[PDB]
Amino acid sequence: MENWSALELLPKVGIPTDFLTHVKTSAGEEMFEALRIYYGDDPERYNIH
Amino acid sequence: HSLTPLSMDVIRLGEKTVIMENLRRVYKNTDTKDPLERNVDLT
Amino acid sequence: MEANIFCTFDHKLSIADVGKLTKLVAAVVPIPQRLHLIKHYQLGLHQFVDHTRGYVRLRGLLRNMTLTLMRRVEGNQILLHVPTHGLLYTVLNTGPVTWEKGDALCVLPPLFHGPLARENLLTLGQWELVLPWIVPMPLALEINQRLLIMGLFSLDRSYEEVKAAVQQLQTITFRDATFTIPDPVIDQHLLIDMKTACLSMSMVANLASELTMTYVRKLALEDSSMLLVKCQELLMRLDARPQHVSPDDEIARLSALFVMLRQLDDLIREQVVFTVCDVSPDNKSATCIFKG
Amino acid sequence: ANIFCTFDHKLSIADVGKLTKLVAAVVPIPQRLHLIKHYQLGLHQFVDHTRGYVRLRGLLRNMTLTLMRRVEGNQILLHVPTHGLLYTVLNTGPVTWEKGDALCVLPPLFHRENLLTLGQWELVLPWIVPMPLALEINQRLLIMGLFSLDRSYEEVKAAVQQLQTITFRDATFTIPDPVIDQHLLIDMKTACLSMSMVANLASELTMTYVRKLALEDSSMLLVKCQELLMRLDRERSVGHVSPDDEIARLSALFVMLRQLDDLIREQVVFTVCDVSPDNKSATCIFKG
Amino acid sequence: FEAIFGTFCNRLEWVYFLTSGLAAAAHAIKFHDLNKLTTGKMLFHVQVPRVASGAGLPTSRQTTIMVTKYSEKSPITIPFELSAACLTYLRETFEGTI
Amino acid sequence: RVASGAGLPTSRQTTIMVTKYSEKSPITIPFELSAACLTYLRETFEGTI
After folding, report:
1. How many whole angstroms separate alpha carbon D51 and alpha carbon D188?
2. Centroid of chain to Cα C181
3. CA atoms of C232 and C225, how far apart (whole Å)
4. In angstroms, what separates the C-alpha of E17 from chain B's closest C-alpha?
5. Which chain F residue lies closest to D41 (C-alpha atoms)?
6. CA–CA distances in Å: residue D6 to residues C78, C186, C277, D38, D78
7. How far apart are CA D128 and CA C88, in angstroms?
8. Where does the record locate the signal sequence feature (chain A)?
9. Would you give the DSSP letter of residue D175?
10. Distance from CA of D254 to the nearest CA of F (A)
11. Which of F14, F16, F20 is closest, CB to CB, to A33?
């Protein structure tokens, strides 16, 4: 289980992202080992504990 | 009123110079289907 | 009212507890008592879960409970919020049921879903967060109907006669999912429901007009279609000018028959608690109107 | 909580003037959006020539009900009310409201001054009617549907003419006959056959289930139910089954009464407590 | 120990209407209060050219005709959502800590 | 995402997060030294040529 909230809070490196197919297609057809997809604004990153 | 220089590809054909455009970049990774790729029916 | 409820935990929550309890924000959890401060044992259905007693018992306890939406967890406090009628909330479906837009949602105890894992949550000691299922109305009254028909059919039958029929009745298929009703015992409450069914059916048979009785035979003489074939087939193995024409008799009988039919319908129909109008395309949450 | 409606058609002075007369009336839309097209406005999208009143009554149940509250331009603004708050609504049905009525929504039966037409489309709004009149209209329609197979007789013609006419406080109007070209529309037909089928299945199954439950506890109620059944059978006297088929009969009974839940039940939508002298409009508390 | 070797985000491309080639087909006008208008139209006064012909052949006197074009309306919309926690931490800046 | 027309559904903003994991693949090769080389590598006898 990955700590996605730290990934959201921590600083990131901005990269040109290249998927051959649509992002939703390569996510939906299980190209990636671990995924987290959410819609809207997810408050989970704000409750630091 | 003012103009801004920008670069694009141009084809010269029959004394008309025409801009060539490719809207791939608008619809990439978006949820909306590109309307220039369509379905055509035949009976 | 007590618009907010504080739930305090006696077990110290690990990092994993706080994480998984945070992911559950906006889930629908019930409380028995509607009090401003409660202890974590009272949270959820685990206080009542008891598989030797039947599904109808837990259904009866649940339909009387007070329902809340989970909010931000802090140190040993969980902060449950009671929704109010007519307002708009975001609700979470931990259940495996699919929600389509415009659905009317009911609360029921969980059913058996194929994988058998069912995702036990927050097993603190030997307490557990057993959440109910938030189910759309069609499946809700389908399970209530099948449960009533099991009770009504299987009386005075032996287990050999019963077995295949109730195996077929327990399984429900809904939107390409498959669920099974856990423990359909012949309760005292179920016998009360069956008695109400019998009285309402007696009054339907007695107070129905002759028009309401004989319409199908006349249509069968007149008409032929697959629907009418099925209707006739239901009557088959037991299978003219009106001598009285009375609009007032018809109106009296029909206004009484609708009452009896509502009585018979309440045995199947649950209380709508939410109505959805927005569904996340991953089917993990919805926007809903709270109803009661 | 405002919903924007836009017109895909050329509006005119008379259209906007016609539309501004409705600046508090109840308009239902199929589902909640922030920006909808006028085609979704009103009940016109659902109208066809094969299903009719019962189908509309079912469809109108799970629409979202809205009040019109401006015309800014080529667009119409709609406000979706919330439960318990007090709102001003326009009466445009066939009757007048008194203080403290419970108001219901019905698919409309009469239709000129209201009708905004554009491009084969026209704004059609439901009736806001007090609960007793909705119940009585409903029962009258259903009884006219059950008389539909013996219109060959003059007394039944007279009885249907009496059913068509309803009088309610200082108003009188004829409910249209659900039988057109001697034939009943598909949904009224299936409603009627569901009513008759549930009646027949009850009359066939009740004796066996009374016996089964009386074997458990022979309460006095079961005595009176069994006596009533025996009396019914004496009246019928003037002139074993498999487990699968028993379950089929029970399931058919219940699925048939599921067909009636739209007819037998009746939602209150507005409670009225303030009326203009004109009886054109009232302020109501919203139920939803 | 387990190691996180990097955390990354995508820098998406911005696209603008005026700087697209499709914009060449358009004449773009910003109108402050479109929301007021119910209908809007443009007036075209077109001259039709003619050929003087033999005295016996008939002809017509069309110098100009006037043709009116009506604007076709098509609004667009898009939502964005902010959480209550986001609004709290944006608006109610605690002096607090780091 | 793209702004939509009237009466159509709108597209929610969605965050997709993925994790990529490293793979191990060690390599090995032996080499043998006999006792004779090990003893002559270290022992000397009067230092004859």
Report:
1. 8
2. 11
3. 10
4. 10
5. F7
6. 45, 57, 21, 6, 11
7. 25
8. none
9. P
10. 37
11. F20
